[PDB]
Write a protein that binds this ligand. Structure first.
Ligand code: ANP
Ligand code: MG
Ligand code: MG
Length: 1335
C-alpha cells in the first residue's frame, strides 16, 4: 500500500502541493490500524510516513484534546521515534505549537502505565518506553523539561516506602524543610491539580512495578513472546539513561533502590535464558554499574575511596546494630569485625541458614521492606530476601579496579556479539548494550569510560572484518588426522609455524595479574617478496591477532562469505598481541637493520596480562584447555587503522591519573553548570591591557573593529596613530584606550624589520582574536571560507609576542590544516627556531620550510655554524687575537667578557650627552661596516641612541641564539636534539589529534609543558581525541598549567568519521566535543564573511549560519562577477529522469550508481573541455563511492586517449572533499528511490560549498524537494530551470558578466541523451577543424 500512504499524503498533507483536503481524523485512525499496526510496525511504512512529513503537516498541527485518541498518541510517538532513528530534528513542530503538548504528554504517561495486554499491546507500550526515553534524554528542550520536571524532582519521593522516606530525611536533615515546603504548597492546590501532581510524582515508581510484573511473566524454559523480551530490554535502557544523568538520577536513584528492581532482575527467569535474555543481561550489567556509581547524589561530586569505604562500613554497622538488638541467631555476626563479615561468602554463611521470615524481619529493620506482622509468613522468596541483604552489604571493588582488570583486546566472545559489536546492517529498531554521548556525564570517570568502551567496541568491528576476510582467504580445511591445511593464502595473515610463551612476570603488589607476558611467534615467509617485505615491516607496538581455527569442512569445500564465519572456518580463539620486535640470528630483539637469511621469521610479542591471567585461571580452575598452545594463524593489520590499543591504553592511564584539568573547564567538560563561565569576560584573571601588535593595519581599521565602543587614543597627532597598537579594556565602560607604540629597533639592517600581518580582519574576526589572547575558553564557529586559518595564526602570533614565556600547543585533525597554518605562520614575525611539528612519518613535506624534528635540528645546526662565524668576525673587528673557532660555550664567555663590558662602558658614557658622542664612542663600528652607511644620522641624540641600542640588540640576539643552540653540542644524536626542541626551545608545537593520542605517554615522560592550546577542524575531531590534548603534561603545584583553550571549527559541516554507522545511530559516537559544547550553550564567535566563492554560490549554504555574508573582495572583484563560458547560469540543479528504464542502480549491494546522471556529468565535463576550460579547474563530486567509480569508468571509456579532453583534478565523494575546493564542481546526487545520507544537512552544506565559481548538480529533483531538511537549499536551486542552459558558441574564457543578457544563442538541453548527442557532434566538428598533439 505504498500507493495508499502516498496518495493520502498527496491529498491531505504532502509538501509542494498548493491545496489540500481539510483535516480528517479518520485518516489518522485508518493509517494507524491498517498501515502501521497491521504491517506489524514495518519500518518502511513508518519511514514513508515520516519522510512525507506526516508529523509536521498532519498529526501535530491538528492535535487537540478533543480529537486525541490511542491511534493519535501512538502515531505521534512513532514519528518522533523514527526521527531519532534517522537522526533528524525530532521536536521542532512541538516547539512551534506548544499549546497542547502538556495534555499530550500526560496521556502518554497514562498509556505507558495502562494495564498489560489491555488497551495497549506490549509492543505499543515498548514504543512508548522508547519515546519516553527520548524525552528524558532531551531535557535541553524547555517544552519537554517543563513536563518532565514533576516526574523526577524531590516530590517523586512520595513513591518511596514510608520508612525509607523517613530514613532519608534523617540521613539528610536539611531535606526535611524542603519536604515540608512541598507539602505546604500542595495545600494551595485544587483537588484535580493535586491528583495530577501525585500521579506524576508516582509515575516512575509505578512504571517500575509494571516492569517487574512483565518481567515475572517470562517463563524459564517454555516459549516466550519476543514482545515481553523487548519491553524488558527497552525498560533497562530507560533505567540506565535516567541513572546516568544527574538531574534524573538525583532523586530517582533512591526510588530505584527502594524498589529492589536490580535484585529482581538478577534472579529473573529472563537473565537465566542464555539466548533470549543475553541482551537483557548485558543491559543489566550496565545498569548495575550506574546504580552503584561512585557519586554523591546530592552534591554531584565523585566519591573518594574513603567515602566509599565509610558508606560500606556504615551499612554493616547498622546491620550489626539490628542484629545485636533483635536476632540472637546473629549474635556472633553482630560482634565480629567488619572485614570478617562483609564478604559475599561470609554474608551467605551468616544469613543463608536463616528462615525467610527472619530475613524479611532483618530487611524491615533496615527500612528495606514493610514489617512482617506477628505470626505471618513472608510472601517473598528466600533467594530474593537473601540476595537483597547480601548484595546490599557485600564488599565492592571500585570502578578503577574494575577498569584495570579489563583486557585491551577483544576475544572471540566479543568480536561476533552484535549486541555490543553491531554490523552496519543495524536498523535501530532494537537497542544495544552501548554507552551514549549527548550533553552531560556524571563524573570524569563516567565521561572517560563511555569513550573508552565506545572506542573499544567500535574498533572491534573493523577487527571482525579484517579477521573474516584474511582467514577466509586462507581457506582452512580439514586434513588427516584431524589437522588443518590452508587451501589459500592471504596478504594480511600467515600460518603460525611455532608459538611459545617465554615470559610470565610476577604481579605488582596488589594487582592479581602478571606485569608482563611475552611470547615468541614464528612464521615461514614462503611468499612473494612484496609480502615478505611487509611482514618484515612490522615494528614495535604494532598489534597483531593470534587465531585458532579447527576447520569444519573437508578439503576443497567452497566458502560462502554470506554464511556465519565461525562455523565456516571453525573459529575457536582470538587473542591480541603487540610486537616487541623481530629476532635476529643472534637471538636479539631488533630495535642499520640486518639482512636475515632463510624464510623463517620469529617475533617476540606482548600478550595482554589480564587476558592471560583469566585464561590461566580458567584453565587451572575449570580444566579449560591452554589457549596459548593452540594458535595456528597470525594476522597483521594496516598501521593507520590499528591504533585502537594504544588509544585505549592512553584513556585508561588518564583514568588512573588525577586528571587535573583547569577548574574553570571541569564543569563545562562534564556538560553541566554555566556554559559561559569560561568566557574571557568572566575570567577573574582577564588581562586589562593587550598589545595587538600588527593586528590592525591602521587606526581606522582599529576603530572599525569595535562598532559598539568609544576609542580614545593616548596621542592626538594623527601621524603617530599608526600600528602597532596597545588596547586597554575597562572593568563610559564602552571606552577603549588605544596606545600606539614603536617597535624596538632591531639593528642597522632595514631588512631585519619584522614581517607584518596584511589581513584586514573584520570586527567579528577581531572578537575571536581578542578572545584567544585572553585566559579562558574561546570557541570560534567558522563557516566555509570565513578565514579560520588567518584568525588562528593571528592569535598564535599575538600570544607569541605578548607572552614570550608561554608555549602554545596546536592540534588539528589533518596534516593539511597544519600545512596551511605553517604556511601563514611563515609570513609573520615568528622565528622559525621557535617552531616545531610532530608527526609519525615519512609525511610529504608541503611547506617551504621543514618544521619536523629533522628539519628543525638541521636548521639549528646550520644556524649555529653561521652565528659562530659572526662571533669570529666580531672578535676580529674588535682587534682581539685568536685563531681558534668559537663554540657556543666560548661564544658565551666572549659575550660577557668582550661584548657586555664594551657596551656597559659605552652606556656609562653616553647614557648617564651629544649626538656626536653616540657615534664617537660606539664600540662596534667595524663589525657593522657591511651594513648600509652611515649607521648614525647625527640629527638628534634620541634617534642615534636608539640606533645604537638596536645594534646591540642585533648582536645580543646572535648570542641568545647560540646559548639556546649549546644543547646541540651537548647532545649528539638527532633524537636527543629533537627532545631539546620539544621540551625547551620551541614556543609553538603542532601535531594532529591522532599523533597526540599515540604520543601522550612519551610526552608526559619527557616533561612536555605548554600553556595554551589552539585547535582547528575541531568539529571533525572525536570527543575523546579532543579531551586528550588537554593532558599532554603533568599538573603544576596541583593545578593544570593550561591558561587558554581555543577551538576553531564548524559543527554545520561534517563530523568525525565513524566506520560503522551503527555506533552513530545508537550512541551518537560521531559527536565532537566542539559540537557538544555548542549544544551545551558555550558562547561562540561566529565568523560572518567568506572570501573564496561567489556570493550567489554562498547563498546555497549561508542560510545555515548566523549572519553569514561576504567579504568586500568577493563582492567587488571582477573574477567573482564573470560568468562561466558556455553556461548561462553560474549554478544549476539539473533534473535527470530514467535512462533505459533505470534510475538508481546497485550492481553490488550498497554500491549505488546512476548511469543517467554519470553519463550526463561526464558529457558536461567534455563539453567544458571542448570549450577550452582548464580541465584541472574542474572537479567531480558525488555522494556515493559506487557512482564515483562509475564516473571514473566513463571518463576512461569516453575520453580515453582524447587530446582535446583532459582529466578533472579529482573524481571523488563529497565526504572525501572536505576542506577542499575547485573553481568548478560537477555534482551527482545519484538517488531516485530514497534520499539517503544527504538528508544530513551537514553533508548538504559541504556539498554546496566546494565550488568557487561554478556548481552544477545532477539529481532526481522531485525526490530531494520532498525532504524537509533540504528545503532551504533546494528551494533556491529550483528557482532556476532544471534543464541545462548552454551557450556553445562562447569559448572559455569569456568576458560576459553574471547578470548581462548573453550575445550568443542559448540552447536548452532537456536530457542526458540530447547532451551526449550534442557533445559527440561538437567533438566530431572539432576533430575535423583542429588537431592537438601530446605524446
Ligand atoms: N578579514 C579578511 N579580509 C580580507 N581577506 C580575508 C579576510 N579573512 C579571510 N580572508 C581571505 O579569504 C580567503 C578565504 O579564506 P580561507 O582560508 O580559504 O577560509 P578558511 O576558514 O581559513 N578554511 P576553509 O573554510 O576551508 O576555506 C583567504 O584567502 C583568506 O586569506
Ligand atoms: Mg528549546
Ligand atoms: Mg582551512
Amino acid at each position: 500500500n505504498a500507493e495508499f500512504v502516498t496518495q493520502l499524503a498527496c491529498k491531505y498533507w504532502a509538501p509542494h502541493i498548493k491545496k489540500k483536503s481539510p483535516f480528517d481524523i479518520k485518516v489518522i485512525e485508518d493509517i494507524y490500524e491498517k498501515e502501521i499496526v497491521k504491517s506489524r510496525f514495518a519500518i518502511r511504512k513508518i519511514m514513508l510516513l515520516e519522510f512525507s512529513q506526516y508529523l509536521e503537516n498532519y498529526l501535530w498541527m491538528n492535535y487537540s484534546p478533543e480529537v486525541s485518541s490511542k491511534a493519535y498518541l501512538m502515531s505521534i510517538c512513532c514519528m518522533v521515534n523514527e526521527k531519532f532513528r534517522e537522526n533528524v530534528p525530532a521536536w521542532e513542530i512541538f516547539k512551534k505549537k506548544p499549546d497542547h503538548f502538556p495534555f499530550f504528554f500526560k496521556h502518554i504517561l497514562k498509556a505507558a502505565l495502562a494495564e498489560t495486554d489491555g488497551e495497549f499491546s506490549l509492543h505499543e507500550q515498548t514504543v512508548l518506553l522508547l519515546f519516553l526515553d527520548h524525552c528524558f534524554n532531551s531535557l535541553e528542550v524547555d517544552l519537554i523539561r517543563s513536563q518532565v520536571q514533576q516526574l523526577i524532582s524531590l516530590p517523586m519521593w512520595m513513591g518511596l516506602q514510608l520508612a525509607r522516606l523517613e530514613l532519608e530525611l534523617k540521613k539528610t536533615p536539611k531535606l526535611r524543610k524542603f519536604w515540608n515546603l512541598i507539602k505546604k504548597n500542595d495545600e494551595k492546590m485544587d483537588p484535580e491539580a493535586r491528583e495530577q501532581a501525585y500521579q506524576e510524582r508516582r509515575f516512575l515508581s509505578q512504571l517500575i512495578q509494571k516492569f517487574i510484573s512483565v518481567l515475572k511473566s517470562v517463563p524459564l524454559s517454555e516459549p516466550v513472546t519476543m514482545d515481553k523480551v523487548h519491553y524488558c530490554e527497552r525498560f533497562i535502557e530507560l533505567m540506565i539513561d535516567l541513572e546516568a544523568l544527574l538531574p534524573t538520577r538525583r532523586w530517582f536513584n533512591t526510588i530505584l533502590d527502594d524498589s529492589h528492581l536490580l535484585v529482581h532482575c538478577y534472579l529473573s527467569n529472563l537473565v537465566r535464558r542464555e539466548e533470549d535474555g543475553h541482551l537483557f543481561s548485558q543491559l543489566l550489567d550496565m545498569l548495575k554499574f550506574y546504580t552503584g556509581f561512585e557519586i554523591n547524589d546530592q552534591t554531584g561530586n565523585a566519591l573518594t575511596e574513603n567515602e566509599m569505604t565509610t558508606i560500606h562500613y556504615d551499612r554493616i554497622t547498622s546491620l550489626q546494630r539490628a542484629a545485636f538488638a533483635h536476632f540472637p541467631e546473629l549474635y556472633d555476626f553482630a560482634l565480629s569485625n567488619v572485614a570478617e563479615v562483609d564478604t559475599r561468602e561470609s554474608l551467605v554463611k551468616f544469613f543463608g541458614p536463616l528462615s525467610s521470615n527472619t530475613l524479611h524481619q532483618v530487611a524491615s529493620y533496615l527500612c528495606l521492606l514493610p514489617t512482617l506482622p506477628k505470626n505471618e509468613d513472608t510472601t517473598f522468596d528466600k533467594e530474593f530476601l537473601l540476595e537483597l541483604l547480601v548484595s546490599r552489604h557485600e564488599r565492592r571493588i571500585s570502578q578503577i579496579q574494575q577498569l584495570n582488570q579489563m583486557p585491551l583486546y577483544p576475544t572471540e566472545k566479543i568480536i561476533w556479539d552484535e549486541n555490543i559489536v553491531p554490523t552496519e546492517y543495524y536498523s535501530g529498531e532494537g537497542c544495544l548494550a552501548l554507552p551514549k554521548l549527548n550533553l552531560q556525564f556524571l563524573t570524569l570517570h563516567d565521561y572517560l569510560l563511555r569513550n573508552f568502551n565506545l572506542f573499544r567496541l567500535e574498533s572491534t568491528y573493523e577487527i571482525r572484518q579484517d579477521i573474516e576476510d584474511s582467514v577466509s582467504r586462507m581457506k582452512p580445511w580439514q586434513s588427516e588426522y584431524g589437522g588443518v591445511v590452508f587451501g589459500g593464502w592471504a596478504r594480511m595473515a600467515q600460518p603460525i609455524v611455532a608459538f611459545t610463551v617465554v615470559e610470565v612476570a610476577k604481579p605488582n603488589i596488589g594487582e592479581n595479574w602478571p606485569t608482563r607476558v611475552r611470547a615468541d611467534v614464528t612464521i615461514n615467509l614462503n611468499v612473494r617478496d612484496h609480502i615478505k617485505d611487509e611482514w618484515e615491516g612490522l615494528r614495535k607496538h604494532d598489534v597483531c591477532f593470534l587465531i585458532t581455527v579447527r576447520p569444519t569442512k573437508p578439503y576443497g569445500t567452497k566458502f560462502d562469505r554470506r554464511r556465519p564465519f565461525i562455523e565456516q572456518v571453525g573459529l575457536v580463539y582470538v587473542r591480541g598481541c603487540e610486537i616487541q620486535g623481530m629476532l635476529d640470528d643472534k637471538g636479539r630483539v631488533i630495535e642499520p637493520r640486518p639482512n636475515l637469511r632463510g624464510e623463517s621469521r620469529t617475533f617476540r610479542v606482548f600478550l595482554d596480562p589480564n587476558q592471560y591471567q583469566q585464561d590461566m585461571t580458567n584453565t587451572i580452575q575449570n580444566g579449560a584447555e591452554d589457549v596459548y598452545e593452540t594458535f595456528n594463524i597470525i594476522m597483521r593489520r594496516k598501521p593507520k587503522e590499528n591504533n585502537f590499543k594504544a588509544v585505549l591504553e592512553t584513556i585508561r592511564n588518564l583514568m588512573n591519573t588525577d586528571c587535573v584539568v583547569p577548574d574553570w573547564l571541569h564543569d563545562i567538560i562534564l556538560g553541566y553548570g554555566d556554559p559561559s563561565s569560561a568566557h574571557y569576560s568572566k575570567m577573574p584573571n582577564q588581562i586589562a591591557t593587550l598589545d595587538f601588535n600588527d593586528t590592525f593595519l591602521s587606526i581606522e581599521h582599529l576603530k572599525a573593529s569595535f562598532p559598539g565602543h568609544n576609542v580614545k587614543v593616548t596621542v592626538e597627532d594623527p601621524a603617530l596613530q599608526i600600528p602597532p597598537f596597545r588596547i586597554t579594556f575597562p572593568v563610559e565602560a564602552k571606552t577603549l584606550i588605544v596606545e600606539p607604540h614603536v617597535i624596538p629597533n632591531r639593528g642597522p639592517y632595514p631588512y631585519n624589520q619584522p614581517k607584518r600581518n596584511t589581513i584586514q580582519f573584520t570586527h567579528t574576526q577581531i572578537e575571536a582574536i581578542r578572545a584567544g589572547m585572553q585566559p579562558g575558553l574561546t570557541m570560534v564557529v567558522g563557516p566555509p571560507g570565513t578565514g579560520k586559518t588567518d584568525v588562528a595564526v593571528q592569535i598564535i602570533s599575538n600570544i607569541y609576542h605578548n607572552f614570550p614565556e608561554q608555549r602554545t600547543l596546536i592540534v588539528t585533525h589533518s596534516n593539511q590544516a597544519l600545512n596551511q597554518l605553517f604556511e601563514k605562520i611563515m609570513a609573520l614575525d615568528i622565528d622559525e627556531r621557535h617552531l616545531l611539528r610532530l608527526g609519525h612519518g615519512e609525511e610529504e613535506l608541503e611547506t617551504e620550510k621543514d618544521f619536523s624534528r629533522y628539519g628543525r635540528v638541521n636548521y639549528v645546526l646550520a644556524r649555529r655554524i653561521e652565528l659562530l662565524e659572526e662571533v669570529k668576525r666580531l672578535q676580529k673587528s674588535l682587534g682581539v687575537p685568536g685563531d681558534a673557532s668559537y663554540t657556543c660555550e666560548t661564544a658565551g664567555y666572549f659575550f660577557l667578557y668582550q661584548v657586555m663590558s664594551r657596551w656597559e662602558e659605552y652606556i656609562s658614557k653616553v647614557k648617564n650627552p651629544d649626538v656626536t658622542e653616540v657615534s664617537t664612542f660606539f664600540p662596534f663600528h667595524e663589525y657593522f661596516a657591511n651594513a648600509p652607511q652611515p649607521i648614525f644620522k647625527g640629527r638628534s641624540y634620541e634617534e642615534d641612541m636608539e640606533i645604537a641600542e638596536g645594534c646591540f640588540r642585533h648582536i645580543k640576539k646572535i648570542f641568545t641564539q647560540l646559548e639556546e643552540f649549546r644543547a646541540s653540542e651537548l647532545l649528539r644524536s638527532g633524537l636527543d636534539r629533537s627532545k631539546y626542541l620539544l621540551v625547551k626551545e620551541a614556543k609553538i608545537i603542532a601535531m594532529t589529534c591522532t599523533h597526540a593520542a599515540l604520543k601522550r605517554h612519551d610526552l608526559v615522560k619527557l616533561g612536555f609543558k605548554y600553556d595554551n592550546i589552539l585547535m582547528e577542524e575541531a568539529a571533525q575531531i572525536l570527543e575523546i581525541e579532543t579531551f586528550i590534548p588537554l593532558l599532554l603534561q603533568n599538573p603544576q603545584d596541583g593545578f593544570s598549567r593550561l591558561k587558554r583553550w581555543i577551538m576553531i571549527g564548524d559543527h554545520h559541516q561534517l563530523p568525525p568519521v565513524i566506520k560503522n554507522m551503527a555506533f552513530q545511530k545508537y550512541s551518537n559516537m560521531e559527536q565532537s566535543l566542539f559540537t557538544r559544547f555548542v549544544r551545551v550553550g558555550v558562547p561562540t564567535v561566529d565568523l560572518d564573511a567568506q572570501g573564496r566563492a561567489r556570493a550567489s554560490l554562498c547563498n546555497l549554504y549561508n542560510w545555515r549560519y548566523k549572519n553569514l555574508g561576504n567579504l568586500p573582495h568577493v563582492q567587488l572583484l571582477p573574477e567573482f562577477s564573470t560568468a562561466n563560458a558556455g553556461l548561462l547560469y553560474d549554478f544549476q540543479l539539473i533534473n535527470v529522469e530514467d535512462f533505459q528504464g533505470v534510475g538508481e542502480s546497485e550492481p553490488n549491494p550498497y554500491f549505488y550508481q546512476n548511469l543517467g546522471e554519470a553519463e550526463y556529468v561526464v558529457a558536461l565535463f567534455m563539453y567544458m573541455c571542448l570549450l577550452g576550460y582548464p580541465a584541472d579547474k574542474i572537479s567531480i563530486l558525488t555522494t556515493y563511492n559506487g557512482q564515483k567509480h562509475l564516473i571514473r569508468d566513463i571518463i576512461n571509456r569516453r575520453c580515453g586517449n582524447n587530446p582535446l579532453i583532459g582529466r578533472p583534478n579529482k573524481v571523488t565523494t563529497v565526504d572525501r572533499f572536505q576542506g577542499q575546493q575547485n573553481d568548478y564542481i560537477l555534482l551527482s546526487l545519484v538517488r531516485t528511490r530514497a534520499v539517503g545520507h544527504l538528508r544530513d544537512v551537514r553533508r548538504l552544506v559541504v556539498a554546496m560549498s566546494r565550488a568557487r565559481l561554478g556548481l552544477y548538480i545532477f539529481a532526481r529533483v522531485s525526490l530531494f524537494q520532498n525532504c524537509f531538511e533540504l528545503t532551504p537549499a533546494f528551494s533556491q536551486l529550483t528557482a532556476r530551470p532544471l534543464h541545462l542552459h548552454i551557450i556553445p558558441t562562447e569559448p572559455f574564457p569569456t568576458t560576459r558578466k553574471n547578470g548581462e543578457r548573453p550575445s550568443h544563442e542559448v540552447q536548452i538541453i532537456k536530457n542526458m541523451p540530447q547532451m551526449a548527442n550534442f557533445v559527440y557532434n561538437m567533438y566530431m566538428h572539432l576533430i575535423q577543424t583542429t588537431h592537438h598533439y601530446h605524446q
